[PDB]
Design a protein around this ligand. Structure first.
Ligand SMILES: [Zn+2]
Length: 230
């Protein structure tokens, strides 16, 4: 809401044009920012960056006037970490359509990139953080009640909505207790507590499947993200 503006954030999308200029999307504490750098920092993917940005009535894209690298995670150069970082970025972009993206969502996102970069189990960090991001977006699964009939404490898969069905609405067998436990409490408890309670990787494919379904149903700017899910 001004001509010129200083913003700090993380590059979550980056495309160089044949013309030689960099079109970037950033997540900042004040929300998503779409910007262009015509042609210090090269605004590299997943870099935490400080920019001065001009936008007037004759340019719909804000124009990057100066850009300084404030922080980077060089460890996202590892294909597997990079894979999950790219998943978090695309997830954040699709969830949250902007301004709608608080200071707390920014901090959560950044923390997710830090977990992905630094921890033994990046796929576990991806999952925890995706359910925690769902919460701050106000796209919360109702796991205390059955998706169809409303019966408390549903324990079964939900093939259509990605939520939870009770035994009497469900065709499929119950989830294992640890999947169930996580599906119930992932959104509400701390990042750290969920980090110290990892779900076994044999049970994980089912968490991704519920997550896909739920997002495909509740949020519409997807397909890019779907393609990066394990
Ligand atoms: Zn039911």
């Amino acid at each position: 809401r001004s001509r010129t503006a200083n913003r700090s954030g993380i590059v979550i999308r980056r495309r160089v044009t044949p013309a030689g200029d960099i079109i970037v999307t950033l997540l900042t504490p004040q929300g998503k920012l779409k910007a262009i750098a015509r042609g210090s920092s090269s605004l590299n993917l997943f870099h935490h960056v400080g920019v001065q940005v001009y936008q007037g009535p004759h340019n719909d894209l804000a124009s990057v006037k100066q850009a300084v690298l404030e922080g980077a995670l060089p460890t996202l150069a590892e294909p597997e970490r990079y894979a999950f970082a790219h998943l978090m970025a695309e997830f954040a972009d699709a969830l949250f359509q902007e301004g709608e993206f608080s200071e707390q969502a920014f901090d959560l996102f950044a923390a997710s990139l830090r977990g992905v970069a630094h921890q033994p189990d990046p796929e576990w960090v991806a999952l925890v953080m995706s359910y925690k991001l769902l919460g701050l977006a106000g796209v919360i699964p109702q796991t205390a009640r059955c998706a169809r009939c409303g019966a408390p404490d549903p324990e079964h898969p939900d093939p259509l909505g990605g939520q939870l069905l009770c035994s009497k609405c469900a065709a499929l067998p119950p989830y294992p207790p640890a999947v169930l436990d996580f599906l119930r409490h992932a959104v509400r408890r701390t990042v750290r507590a969920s980090f110290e309670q990892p779900v076994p990787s044999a049970d994980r494919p089912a968490l991704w499947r519920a997550l896909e379904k739920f997002v495909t149903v509740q949020v519409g700017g997807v397909h890019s993200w779907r393609q990066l899910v394990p």
